[PDB]
Amino acid sequence: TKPLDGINVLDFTHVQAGPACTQMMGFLGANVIKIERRGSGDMTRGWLQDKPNVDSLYFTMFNCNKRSIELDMKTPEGKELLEQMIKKADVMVENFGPGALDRMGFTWEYIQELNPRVILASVKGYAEGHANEHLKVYENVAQCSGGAAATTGFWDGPPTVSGAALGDSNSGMHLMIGILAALEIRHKTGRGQKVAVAMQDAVLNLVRIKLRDQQRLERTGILAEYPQAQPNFAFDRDGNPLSFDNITSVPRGGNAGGGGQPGWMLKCKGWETDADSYVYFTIAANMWPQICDMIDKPEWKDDPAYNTFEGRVDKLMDIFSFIETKFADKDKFEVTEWAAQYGIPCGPVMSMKELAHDPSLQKVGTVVEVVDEIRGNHLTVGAPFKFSGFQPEITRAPLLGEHTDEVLKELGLDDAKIKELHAKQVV
Amino acid sequence: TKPLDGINVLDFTHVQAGPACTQMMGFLGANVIKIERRGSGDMTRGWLQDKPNVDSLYFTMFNCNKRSIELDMKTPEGKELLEQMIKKADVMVENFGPGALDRMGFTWEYIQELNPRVILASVKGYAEGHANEHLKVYENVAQCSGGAAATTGFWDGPPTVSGAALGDSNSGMHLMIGILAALEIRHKTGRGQKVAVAMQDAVLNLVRIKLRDQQRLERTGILAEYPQAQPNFAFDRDGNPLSFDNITSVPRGGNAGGGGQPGWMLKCKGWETDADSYVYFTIAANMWPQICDMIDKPEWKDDPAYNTFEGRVDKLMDIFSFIETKFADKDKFEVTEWAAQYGIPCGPVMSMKELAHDPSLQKVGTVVEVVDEIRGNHLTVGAPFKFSGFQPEITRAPLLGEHTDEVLKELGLDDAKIKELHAKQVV
Numbered sequence: 001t002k003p004l005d006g007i008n009v010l011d012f013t014h015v016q017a018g019p020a021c022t023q024m025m026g027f028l029g030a031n032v033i034k035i036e037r038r039g040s041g042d043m044t045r046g047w048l049q050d051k052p053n054v055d056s057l058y059f060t061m062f063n064c065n066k067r068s069i070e071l072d073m074k075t076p077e078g079k080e081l082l083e084q085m086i087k088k089a090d091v092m093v094e095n096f097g098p099g100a101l102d103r104m105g106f107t108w109e110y111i112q113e114l115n116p117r118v119i120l121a122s123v124k125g126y127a128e129g130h131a132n133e134h135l136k137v138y139e140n141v142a143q144c145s146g147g148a149a150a151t152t153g154f155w156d157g158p159p160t161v162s163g164a165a166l167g168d169s170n171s172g173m174h175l176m177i178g179i180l181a182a183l184e185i186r187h188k189t190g191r192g193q194k195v196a197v198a199m200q201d202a203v204l205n206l207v208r209i210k211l212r213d214q215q216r217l218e219r220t221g222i223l224a225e226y227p228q229a230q231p232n233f234a235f236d237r238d239g240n241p242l243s244f245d246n247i248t249s250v251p252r253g254g255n256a257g258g259g260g261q262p263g264w265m266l267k268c269k270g271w272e273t274d275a276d277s278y279v280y281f282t283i284a285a286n287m288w289p290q291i292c293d294m295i296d297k298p299e300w301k302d303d304p305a306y307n308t309f310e311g312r313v314d315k316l317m318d319i320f321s322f323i324e325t326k327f328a329d330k331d332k333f334e335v336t337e338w339a340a341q342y343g344i345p346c347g348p349v350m351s352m353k354e355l356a357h358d359p360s361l362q363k364v365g366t367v368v369e370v371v372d373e374i375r376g377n378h379l380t381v382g383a384p385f386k387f388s389g390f391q392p393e394i395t396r397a398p399l400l401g402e403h404t405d406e407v408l409k410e411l412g413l414d415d416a417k418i419k420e421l422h423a424k425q426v427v
Numbered sequence: 428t429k430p431l432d433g434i435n436v437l438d439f440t441h442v443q444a445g446p447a448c449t450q451m452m453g454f455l456g457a458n459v460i461k462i463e464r465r466g467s468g469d470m471t472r473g474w475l476q477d478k479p480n481v482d483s484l485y486f487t488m489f490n491c492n493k494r495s496i497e498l499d500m501k502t503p504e505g506k507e508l509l510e511q512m513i514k515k516a517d518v519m520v521e522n523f524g525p526g527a528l529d530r531m532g533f534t535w536e537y538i539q540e541l542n543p544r545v546i547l548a549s550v551k552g553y554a555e556g557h558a559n560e561h562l563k564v565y566e567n568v569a570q571c572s573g574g575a576a577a578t579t580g581f582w583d584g585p586p587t588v589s590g591a592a593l594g595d596s597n598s599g600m601h602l603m604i605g606i607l608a609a610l611e612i613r614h615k616t617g618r619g620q621k622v623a624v625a626m627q628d629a630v631l632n633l634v635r636i637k638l639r640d641q642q643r644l645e646r647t648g649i650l651a652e653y654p655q656a657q658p659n660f661a662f663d664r665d666g667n668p669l670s671f672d673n674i675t676s677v678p679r680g681g682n683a684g685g686g687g688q689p690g691w692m693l694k695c696k697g698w699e700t701d702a703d704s705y706v707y708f709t710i711a712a713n714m715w716p717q718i719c720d721m722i723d724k725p726e727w728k729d730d731p732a733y734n735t736f737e738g739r740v741d742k743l744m745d746i747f748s749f750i751e752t753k754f755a756d757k758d759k760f761e762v763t764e765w766a767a768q769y770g771i772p773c774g775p776v777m778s779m780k781e782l783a784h785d786p787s788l789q790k791v792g793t794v795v796e797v798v799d800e801i802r803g804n805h806l807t808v809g810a811p812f813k814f815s816g817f818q819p820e821i822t823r824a825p826l827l828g829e830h831t832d833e834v835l836k837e838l839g840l841d842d843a844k845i846k847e848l849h850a851k852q853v854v
């Protein structure tokens with residue numbers, strides 16, 4: 001059995017955040033009916049297509065395990081169809097602009113009237129009640145709003161976006177938690193709820209560690225493990241040394257560990273020509289003697305200035321600069337194995353090329369080849385949660401309106417009524 | 428009333444990923460009993476402390492809504508206590524190293540014997556069956572393993588770690604989806620399941636958009652929305668030109684749009700002295716006329732060299748550069764307000780200082796002042812999902828072993844036999 005078998009999702013979502021959520025629900029067995037606009041549908045269909053007039057990889061990688069119906073929702077017959085669909089839905093999911101779903105006659109209060117059991121789940125930019133509640137926010141804007149950009153990158157460079165979808169997919173995964181939580185409470189109350197996740201808040205949740213640091217900084221005036229705390233290492237734009245003397249908000253720390261276990265990104269053989277020929281090396285406290293054996297400096301093992309975090313904290317960059325010199329003639333996989341024979345936490349920067357074609361990730365179903373007989377096969381990311389009694393069955397993304405009549409017949413409409421709806425341009 | 432009221436969680440978790448998961452379950456009403464090592468407890472207690480001998484903000488911000496019991500689980504008496512606790516639990520959660528729980532004698536097989544309803548939830552570095560399934564992984568190593576580091580930062584710099592916890596907290600939130608999914612099937616089956624999330628997999632899930640890009644790159648040889656698509660824009664450290672002629676794995680694109688429309692991080696008034704005086708500004712294809720009005724370039728509206736995404740490919744970075752000149756005398760908030768007049772997606776880089784003291788985030792319960800009469804009040808991030816039917820009630824993190832006797836009483840032990848366990852150094 002799959003977790004969400006028999007869960008009917010009425011899916012209004014577009015682009016990334018909403019569709020990530022509903023696709024992942026689909027992977028876990030939910031019945032996802034994607035409502036799309038007549039003729040055009042989800043904006044991702046035509047977004048950076050790799051072949052003319054074929055749905056893009058943006059669309060296919062976020063819309064597997066879904067059925068598509070075209071619908072003009074601002075028509076009387078379309079609103080009627082929607083009322084029928086809401087009555088059969090367990091969860092409605094949308095990521096329209098604020099007020100958009102109200103404006104086409106479907107307020108939460110009306111939705112409750114139609115179906116007391118339905119859950120209404122929304123992706124928002126800022127939370128309801130926020131001063132900026134009405135600002136449009138997408139991916140990198142949300143990374144900026146939630147504190148990630150300010151704390152990502154280097155002290156002598158700009159705020160930096162993550163390549164990971166901290167705004168979009170992260171918000172979608174957060175909303176999926178909200179939806180599943182609402183399903184849990186419905187078992188007890190018998191009633192549906194409204195649940196919403198703002199992109200700013202999804203980002204903030206993942207930068208909890210930086211709000212820890214902001215309070216530490218306010219309380220103590222220093223973050224001793226940050227590069228700026230090492231005397232005469234970090235320099236500003238003009239060339240002078242940086243310190244916490246004049247830093248009152250969590251700064252960018254380059255490739256520092258971000259917690260209580262210091263680390264850095266270290267060059268390996270080929271770094272000039274291979275952008276991903278690097279490892280990350282972490283100094284775990286219990287693993288310090290093991291590091292001294294690999295690096296071969298046994299003086300440091302018993303030196304109190306070197307064998308304690310508090311001793312090490314004021315010369316982290318000096319130790320990292322040295323260890324990096326030991327990796328100059330070894331590729332990232334050779335450095336990783338050389339550290340691994342001392343049990344040390346060291347790992348390679350995996351390239352997207354490596355990841356896309358990695359045997360292990362395909363063995364465990366995390367990278368999945370989708371059998372798409374219409375467009376040709378493509379890779380996608382599968383379910384990142386692995387269950388003892390269940391395996392996802394990923395099926396290819398729908399053509400625009402491919403399942404319109406199938407879905408209309410399920411509502412109970414006869415073949416003459418379907419032809420009328422097609423002729424009247426509602427589906 | 429709350430989604431997880433009456434759900435008993437046996438919580439073995441420590442450090443970041445596991446405790447984030449169980450804390451958020453706590454926020455949604457779960458009864459979380461956190462098992463800790465005697466004397467030292469969860470090592471976050473003593474990491475990055477702001478006051479000597481007070482539990483660190485690292486611990487308190489990850490362990491609200493929990494009770495703490497001290498337990499040596501490598502004693503016959505400890506293992507017997509676990510068996511009793513497992514029988515009362517709905518969910519067991521752990522983020523020890525691979526195999527650790529099995530070596531204690533609590534394999535999934537034996538756990539099922541003890542309690543056929545209980546769900547076992549794990550965070551590990553890599554998935555079971557992966558070549559690296561036995562590796563111990565920390566935050567930035569997981570970012571490196573999952574494709575984030577390789578695709579974050581600039582083309583002429585190193586792979587860059589994200590300030591957001593893509594590895595740890597993100598994995599915890601994913602595990603929460605798995606746990607909630609297992610709770611949903613248990614209503615049908617009456618049986619618990621094992622659910623596991625690999626840190627690599629949680630990262631890769633958020634990097635799905637870069638797997639879209641890898642395939643596009645493999646299929647077409649170019650990513651037209653990336654800075655390197657602009658001829659003579661991007662260069663490596665020795666001045667060699669970077670173009671997609673020689674790029675075979677998704678490159679770092681600086682502050683480019685990712686899964687959003689094209690954008691960039693633009694300087695605002697004060698950028699020389701304020702590290703966070705920037706906005707993110709998006710050039711969405713359907714907003715070009717508005718942008719031309721804003722920056723007073725009417726001649727750009729009807730010029731095919733400027734008015735389509737395709738025409739802008741060879742000059743987009745020049746356009747960003749020119750737009751940025753309009754922000755020289757305006758702070759990030761006035762730039763944001765100006766752009767919002769046109770409906771253009773644009774927003775400020777919010778500093779951690781600005782976020783920690785923002786009234787809106789405290790109004791909507793996303794930043795929360797926790798009442799801690801022992802340690803003094805502190806801020807935390809609350810639930811990122813907002814519900815119509817309930818509000819989290821966040822309560823302070825437990826002192827080490829604060830609830831040991833309280834918890835033992837509930838297990839059916841009386842005063843004479845808990846004293847023996849104290850005596851034997853079991854609790």
Ligand SMILES: *SCCNC(=O)CCNC(=O)[C@H](O)C(C)(C)COP(=O)(O)OP(=O)(O)OC[C@H]1O[C@@H](n2cnc3c(N)ncnc32)[C@H](O)[C@@H]1OP(=O)(O)O
Pocket residue numbers: 014015016017035036037038043071072073074095096097100101103104138139167168169686687688711
């Ligand atoms: S990971 C970050 C990704 N970044 C982006 O997605 C940036 C690009 N995004 C956008 O430009 C918009 O967010 C898009 C994807 C165009 C969606 O815009 P809306 O949220 O307004 O959704 P729609 O464009 O689909 O809706 C426009 C108006 O029309 C109504 N409507 C939607 N769908 C239908 C159907 N099927 N039938 C009739 N009407 C429909 C909406 O309610 C909306 O109404 P307004 O009253 O004009 O707001």
Ligand SMILES: *SCCNC(=O)CCNC(=O)[C@H](O)C(C)(C)COP(=O)(O)OP(=O)(O)OC[C@H]1O[C@@H](n2cnc3c(N)ncnc32)[C@H](O)[C@@H]1OP(=O)(O)O
Pocket residue numbers: 286442443444445462463464465498499500501522523524525526527528530531550551552562563564565566594595596
């Ligand atoms: S979010 C970033 C952290 N990453 C993860 O959460 C990924 C999963 N966790 C891990 O890989 C490890 O837990 C990390 C975080 C890398 C730390 O590694 P350690 O070197 O600390 O190894 P363990 O956590 O597995 O602990 C070592 C042994 O100690 C035993 N143990 C823990 N707690 C107790 C108590 N209370 N009583 C008795 N024994 C206890 C573990 O079972 C483990 O046993 P071994 O069999 O000796 O490994």
Ligand SMILES: [Cl-]
Pocket residue numbers: 014015016017018095168
């Ligand atoms: Cl989106």
Ligand SMILES: [Cl-]
Pocket residue numbers: 209443444447592595596597
């Ligand atoms: Cl974290």
Ligand SMILES: [Cl-]
Pocket residue numbers: 138139686687688689709772
């Ligand atoms: Cl966008």
Ligand SMILES: [Mg+2]
Pocket residue numbers: 719720721722723
């Ligand atoms: Mg003008």
